[PDB]
Amino acid sequence: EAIVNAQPKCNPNLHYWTTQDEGAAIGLAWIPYFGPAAEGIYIEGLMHNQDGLICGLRQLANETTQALQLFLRATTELRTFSILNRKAIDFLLQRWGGTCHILGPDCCIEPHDWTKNITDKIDQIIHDFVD
Amino acid sequence: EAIVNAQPKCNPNLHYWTTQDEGAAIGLAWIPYFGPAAEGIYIEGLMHNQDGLICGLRQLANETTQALQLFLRATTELRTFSILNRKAIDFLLQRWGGTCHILGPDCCIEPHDWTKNITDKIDQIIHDFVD
Amino acid sequence: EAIVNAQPKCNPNLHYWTTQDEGAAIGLAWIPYFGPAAEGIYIEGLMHNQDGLICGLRQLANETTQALQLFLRATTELRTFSILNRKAIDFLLQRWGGTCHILGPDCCIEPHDWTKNITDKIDQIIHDFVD
Amino acid sequence: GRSIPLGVIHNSALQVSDVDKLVCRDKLSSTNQLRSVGLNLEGNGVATDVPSATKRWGFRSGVPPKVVNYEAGEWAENCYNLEIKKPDGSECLPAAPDGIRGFPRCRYVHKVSGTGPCAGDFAFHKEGAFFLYDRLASTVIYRGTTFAEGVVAFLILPQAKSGYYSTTIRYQATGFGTNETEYLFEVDNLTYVQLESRFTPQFLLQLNETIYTSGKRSNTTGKLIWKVNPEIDTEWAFWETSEELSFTVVXXXXXXX
Amino acid sequence: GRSIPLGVIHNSALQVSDVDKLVCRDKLSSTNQLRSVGLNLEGNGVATDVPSATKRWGFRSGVPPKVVNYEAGEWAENCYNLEIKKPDGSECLPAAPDGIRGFPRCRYVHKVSGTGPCAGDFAFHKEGAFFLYDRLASTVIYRGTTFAEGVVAFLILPQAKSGYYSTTIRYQATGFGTNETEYLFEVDNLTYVQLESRFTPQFLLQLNETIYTSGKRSNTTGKLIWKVNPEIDTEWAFWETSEELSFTVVXXXXXXX
Amino acid sequence: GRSIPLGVIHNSALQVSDVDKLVCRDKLSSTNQLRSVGLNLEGNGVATDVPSATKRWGFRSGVPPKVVNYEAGEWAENCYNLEIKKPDGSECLPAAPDGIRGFPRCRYVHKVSGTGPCAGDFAFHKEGAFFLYDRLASTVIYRGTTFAEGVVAFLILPQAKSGYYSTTIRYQATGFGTNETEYLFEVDNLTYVQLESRFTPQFLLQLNETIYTSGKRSNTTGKLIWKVNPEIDTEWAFWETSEELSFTVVXXXXXXX
Numbered sequence A, B, C: 001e002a003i004v005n006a007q008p009k010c011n012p013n014l015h016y017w018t019t020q021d022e023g024a025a026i027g028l029a030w031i032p033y034f035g036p037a038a039e040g041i042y043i044e045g046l047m048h049n050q051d052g053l054i055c056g057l058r059q060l061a062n063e064t065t066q067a068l069q070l071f072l073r074a075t076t077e078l079r080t081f082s083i084l085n086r087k088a089i090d091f092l093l094q095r096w097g098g099t100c101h102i103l104g105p106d107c108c109i110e111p112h113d114w115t116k117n118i119t120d121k122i123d124q125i126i127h128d129f130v131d
Numbered sequence D, E, F: 001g002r003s004i005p006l007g008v009i010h011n012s013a014l015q016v017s018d019v020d021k022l023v024c025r026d027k028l029s030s031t032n033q034l035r036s037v038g039l040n041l042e043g044n045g046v047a048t049d050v051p052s053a054t055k056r057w058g059f060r061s062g063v064p065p066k067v068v069n070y071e072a073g074e075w076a077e078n079c080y081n082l083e084i085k086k087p088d089g090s091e092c093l094p095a096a097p098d099g100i101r102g103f104p105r106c107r108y109v110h111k112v113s114g115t116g117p118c119a120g121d122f123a124f125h126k127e128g129a130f131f132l133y134d135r136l137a138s139t140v141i142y143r144g145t146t147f148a149e150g151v152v153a154f155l156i157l158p159q160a161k162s163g164y165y166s167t168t169i170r171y172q173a174t175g176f177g178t179n180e181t182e183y184l185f186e187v188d189n190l191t192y193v194q195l196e197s198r199f200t201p202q203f204l205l206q207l208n209e210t211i212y213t214s215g216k217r218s219n220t221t222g223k224l225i226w227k228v229n230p231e232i233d234t235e236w237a238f239w240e241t242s243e244e245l246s247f248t249v250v251x252x253x254x255x256x257x
């Protein structure tokens, strides 16, 4: 589906917080004894509404809520950390969960170079058909 | 292996309970504030012993217990929710965990249509070998 | 990268403990009521420093600590059991996460036998080109 | 240790998926096709009367409790709910952990209150089966929380292939989980019946009915225990199946014939 | 039930990834490309004043609380921190579970202390949204723990594409979470202001400033409540936007004009 | 932040699997081939005496504890078990969380009871290593729970490639986790020995033996502290390696020469 923002307003800027994912730690700062407290583990970034991404993001999260809430009703886990790993697994199963029928619509195999390795090397058997 | 029911009796009918997996929520019922209490999140179904499935199912669960109990002895997780995701991962690794040798016994790739794309299109080079 | 042991000393022998992974349970010992207490679920093995594996292992664990500690700072899970499953998922996504371009460097498909099924069976169309 | 079996359907039959062999014909397109499932011991033909059921459970120390989840279960005829103390008044079973609720579908909840020695930290199943709670299967019994006995299975499915009544039945118990356990069915707080293995739930609800209407309750401050004579009868499992009795008073024991 | 949407970018636009169709062009090379994300209700234009915000929350029993995690969030202007009791002094909200900390970036923390009937075990969001804490989104409000209202999204990304100030604002409350809720902004423990929906955070901090400097605090042991007249004004969201007032004393109520 | 290393074997050598490069020759056929593993600091040659070991740990607030699991570990010579209080009697370390048990294989458990300032909510490893418990590695020390110091590794394996004795050694401690920490080895509740870094476990068990048999225990209600003279000796790690002493009495301190 497409994302139609249907909210009263949109803050077109996302001033965000998160944890560090890239970059080596400065000396001993990685050691929990020496490192920052809970308040000081965050980084920030600022994102503008290029491609209408920020406003779509707000709408996406709004639309996610129903499915997400129903999922949480059906789980007995108190805290759920596995949603993204499960999506990765489903990503793989959608593609590789059965037999990959080559040139079928549901099989992500490209024989492009393998076509012009076989059809190109016919000219070392029909071209070299020397009498 | 095959499933041999070795129980004194078998209730051939499975009157089952579970949570809803399909269908949109009726209005606001998805909102936890408005939705059903713990007692009212269940659906039901009735299954009969077609293909001897119900009686096999009872036997399967009985046979599962040893392996399952040993697995729970070896884990330090208090509550285990990851068994099915791990089986999905093992499903994929069994098939795609190494290099897929095409036409090998352990590689689920079908070149069926790819055979009759190459062997069919030889009649635009040997058939069109016009002097 | 390569593993350079940079510790003051190395105990070249690994006297290890773990849980049982292979072998059927002796009678009823799998039943938690009858089985061993927490103290008696362990097996042991002894490993020597063949291929310098034990000393590398010690160094590997030392080098793992920074990345591991930073990962634990960034998670809100109290106890993390998903690292290995996530590595399995990343193993698969590295290989099968896009379209597999055959004979490309990032696509683990071997057409070895499929080459000498097609190039071998050209001698039932050019060899049997009977006038 | 050994690999946890996975159920799959081949040749119109459920089979354990063979680990060592690979079947490319088998298809797992989604993680929804995987299911974990709870089946009740009832459906294998086990005795479900309280005396027979409790003899399958026992106390043990040194073994940490373990819990595994399941998505779907079977409606039970017989569930159990235990409030067991030592004779010094200390609790024998632990409070239900956060998030563990009683089994969702029970036609009869056998609520046993009483006492026993409780020689162990947790109560396990002597036959290795699980105590099934609401979508969580535990190795042990939690206090005052309704459970069905059962076992767990895991399946790969293909991609294409009356309300709820519940009645509670109350029991006193002495010497719980030992060789000489005495049970009493509760009519009211002063009127009881000596329990036996042969009494079904429906017989207990009829016997209760007959006691209330015939006026055979305790009409004093004292405890009244009705015994049933062996001649009054009560090998068929639950899924395949008046005022004639005379009561006379012999604590204050009595007979019903 | 229905599939949880996953955000993906096609044709320079965010879209919900269509479950039934397979796009081999889409590439997930690593589990880092997957992200879970919290967006605040603020950014959709909702009223963030305490009176309007609290009317979106309500008490309910029979529903177990649930928590889901998220990796990244949005800096808030408005967060809330509730210390609500019943008139008999018992706590209305539960202590923060182990590992749940307050929302990390709040420009204003609206700390509401007070009372109400609290007719339910947990406080939920009436509109189905989440209470966002530090990288954990809960369905319910925890006691004395700072939260932003918000919702959660999940994304597949491609592979290539001033400090922090916080000010606490304190409120007394009676009849919390009912039709007749009365709020009071706190200047000090004896000096208060009758709250209204139209007052912004910056107006409250200026009004406070003006009270302290002009010397309009309670100079007795008694409680002092300043009312603001309707003429003193205060439809623009936060991200797109002296000594003239005269105070006179009419518990001891008063007016500011 | 940076990617967690994964160990793999190439060219008869353990290597960190290079993230940016893909080796199709590498084979992960099952999730059993993945292993998480605990190696002890002992095996790197660190001082394992109590005085040297405790100086590696320290108290800190503001950092939530974290726990990660591991499947296999190394038998230890030296483990530690701390019962530390403040001088006002309050506990310094938290009770072991549910499911965290002591390290399974310890030849010597150094059980330190005593006091210190404890200027922080949790005790961490100053060198960033872990406290290894039973298949759970924590960033912090739990009260009265046996641990080995260690670190964690993760491996991809290929598909084809005497009992247990434990002795407890008891120590009193003052000023725990500070620059002036005084330790005392316990012979009995009234007989002690001033500790030093150079004393090995086997020396302490021999010194104890010699004290009991020679009859040098406290034969009063008072506390007796034996000092050892510097001349009595005791650079070799554990894995590669009588009645001559005379005791005389100088609380009641004394010397052994």
Ligand SMILES: *[C@@H]1O[C@H](CO)[C@@H](O[C@@H]2O[C@H](CO)[C@@H](O[C@@H]3O[C@H](CO[C@H]4O[C@H](CO)[C@@H](O)[C@H](O)[C@@H]4O)[C@@H](O)[C@H](O)[C@@H]3O)[C@H](O)[C@H]2NC(C)=O)[C@H](O)[C@H]1NC(C)=O
Pocket: B006, B007, B008, B062, B063, B065, D126, D127, D128, D129, D151
């Ligand atoms: C999976 O299904 C299996 C088949 O139904 C279950 O097998 C049961 O296993 C338990 C122990 O784990 C057995 O209990 C034992 O029973 C014997 C015999 O008791 C009486 O019966 C024999 C005649 O059959 C008679 O010779 C004796 O004198 C007794 O009168 C006792 O000696 C033991 O102490 C113990 O109680 C069950 O008998 C057995 N059932 C069957 C039908 O074989 C198994 O438990 C199931 N697994 C799970 C996890 O539920």
Ligand SMILES: *[C@@H]1O[C@H](CO)[C@@H](O[C@@H]2O[C@H](CO)[C@@H](O[C@@H]3O[C@H](CO[C@H]4O[C@H](CO)[C@@H](O)[C@H](O)[C@@H]4O)[C@@H](O)[C@H](O)[C@@H]3O)[C@H](O)[C@H]2NC(C)=O)[C@H](O)[C@H]1NC(C)=O
Pocket: A006, A007, A008, A062, A063, A065, E126, E127, E128, E129, E151
């Ligand atoms: C996702 O975004 C949606 C769009 O912003 C959110 O929709 C909101 O949903 C809630 C209920 O779930 C609505 O609250 C109700 O409002 C009505 C109407 O209130 C007044 O407004 C109308 C004119 O619009 C007027 O006719 C009335 O007289 C009222 O003065 C009330 O009757 C209900 O009792 C209830 O309070 C919101 O109004 C609605 N917003 C919009 C803009 O439609 C949705 O909640 C978002 N989801 C999440 C999880 O955040």
Ligand SMILES: *[C@@H]1O[C@H](CO)[C@@H](O[C@@H]2O[C@H](CO)[C@@H](O[C@@H]3O[C@H](CO[C@H]4O[C@H](CO)[C@@H](O)[C@H](O)[C@@H]4O)[C@@H](O)[C@H](O)[C@@H]3O)[C@H](O)[C@H]2NC(C)=O)[C@H](O)[C@H]1NC(C)=O
Pocket: C006, C007, C008, C062, C063, C065, F126, F127, F128, F129, F151
């Ligand atoms: C992984 O292995 C590394 C190598 O074994 C470990 O390195 C250790 O790191 C810690 C701090 O994180 C160091 O401790 C510091 O030591 C210095 C020096 O102390 C004395 O030694 C030098 C001579 O070498 C001398 O000049 C000084 O005067 C001292 O007498 C202190 O100044 C610091 O305050 C601090 O205590 C270790 O020394 C260091 N070991 C080595 C052999 O370099 C690393 O910790 C391991 N990681 C984990 C997680 O276990």
Ligand SMILES: CN(C)CCOc1ccc(/C(=C(/CCCl)c2ccccc2)c2ccccc2)cc1
Pocket: A074, B014, B016, B017, B018, B019, B020, B021, B045, B047, B057, D035, D036, D037, D038, D039, D071, D072, D073, D074, D155, D157
């Ligand atoms: C993840 N959940 C939201 C969905 C789980 O749903 C189900 C999980 C198993 C079944 C069961 C069955 C019956 C035999 Cl497989 C079923 C499966 C597919 C479609 C219809 C019925 C079942 C099995 C044994 C015991 C109890 C039930 C039904 C629904």
Ligand SMILES: CN(C)CCOc1ccc(/C(=C(/CCCl)c2ccccc2)c2ccccc2)cc1
Pocket: A014, A016, A017, A018, A019, A020, A021, A045, A047, A057, C074, E035, E036, E037, E038, E039, E071, E072, E073, E074, E155, E157
């Ligand atoms: C797993 N963690 C250690 C890493 C998580 O890191 C991030 C998780 C999302 C984003 C977000 C964004 C902005 C729009 Cl996608 C981002 C993504 C990639 C690169 C740079 C920015 C974001 C989104 C909505 C709300 C808040 C933030 C940034 C970092």
Ligand SMILES: CN(C)CCOc1ccc(/C(=C(/CCCl)c2ccccc2)c2ccccc2)cc1
Pocket: B074, C014, C016, C017, C018, C019, C020, C021, C045, C047, C057, F035, F036, F037, F038, F039, F071, F072, F073, F074, F155, F157
């Ligand atoms: C999932 N569990 C039920 C099985 C885990 O089992 C093991 C997990 C690692 C090892 C270890 C080893 C030794 C060197 Cl890799 C091993 C691996 C395979 C076969 C035999 C031995 C090991 C490693 C470092 C420290 C301690 C042990 C052995 C067993």
Ligand SMILES: *[C@@H]1O[C@H](CO)[C@@H](O)[C@H](O)[C@H]1NC(C)=O
Pocket: D179, D180
């Ligand atoms: C329980 O009673 C029976 C009597 O037949 C017998 O097994 C035994 O004497 C008793 N068991 C124990 C453990 O005392």
Ligand SMILES: *[C@@H]1O[C@H](CO)[C@@H](O)[C@H](O)[C@H]1NC(C)=O
Pocket: D189
């Ligand atoms: C009967 O006993 C129960 C359990 O002690 C008690 O809660 C209940 O109030 C009693 N009922 C009557 C009617 O006395």
Ligand SMILES: *[C@@H]1O[C@H](CO)[C@@H](O)[C@H](O)[C@H]1NC(C)=O
Pocket: D167, D168, D169, D170, D186, D187, D205, D208, D209, D212
């Ligand atoms: C016994 O009969 C009375 C009278 O109708 C009824 O109210 C009561 O619930 C019955 N007891 C049980 C255990 O069903």
Ligand SMILES: *[C@@H]1O[C@H](CO)[C@@H](O)[C@H](O)[C@H]1NC(C)=O
Pocket: D214, D215, D216, D217, D218, D219, D249
């Ligand atoms: C009063 O007492 C006896 C039991 O002790 C009982 O059998 C009798 O029926 C009671 N009376 C009435 C009127 O029910």
Ligand SMILES: *[C@@H]1O[C@H](CO)[C@@H](O)[C@H](O)[C@H]1NC(C)=O
Pocket: E179, E180
């Ligand atoms: C709350 O007050 C208003 C008055 O207009 C009205 O909705 C109702 O009388 C009250 N609601 C309840 C539930 O008492």
Ligand SMILES: *[C@@H]1O[C@H](CO)[C@@H](O)[C@H](O)[C@H]1NC(C)=O
Pocket: E189
């Ligand atoms: C004001 O009240 C709060 C809450 O009771 C209290 O903690 C604080 O000490 C008081 N401050 C002063 C200055 O009296």
Ligand SMILES: *[C@@H]1O[C@H](CO)[C@@H](O)[C@H](O)[C@H]1NC(C)=O
Pocket: E167, E168, E169, E170, E186, E187, E205, E208, E209, E212
């Ligand atoms: C009100 O003004 C005083 C005077 O500077 C200041 O100290 C206090 O923090 C202000 N109150 C709030 C809620 O900001």
Ligand SMILES: *[C@@H]1O[C@H](CO)[C@@H](O)[C@H](O)[C@H]1NC(C)=O
Pocket: E214, E215, E216, E217, E218, E219, E249
């Ligand atoms: C003392 O009392 C009144 C409030 O009752 C206040 O308006 C007045 O300004 C105070 N006095 C001074 C000097 O501030």
Ligand SMILES: *[C@@H]1O[C@H](CO)[C@@H](O)[C@H](O)[C@H]1NC(C)=O
Pocket: F179, F180
């Ligand atoms: C600890 O004692 C030593 C004495 O040499 C010195 O480092 C310092 O004076 C003391 N440290 C502290 C923190 O007081």
Ligand SMILES: *[C@@H]1O[C@H](CO)[C@@H](O)[C@H](O)[C@H]1NC(C)=O
Pocket: F189
């Ligand atoms: C020695 O002290 C310990 C710890 O206080 C105590 O538990 C034990 O009973 C004492 N032993 C003797 C023999 O007095």
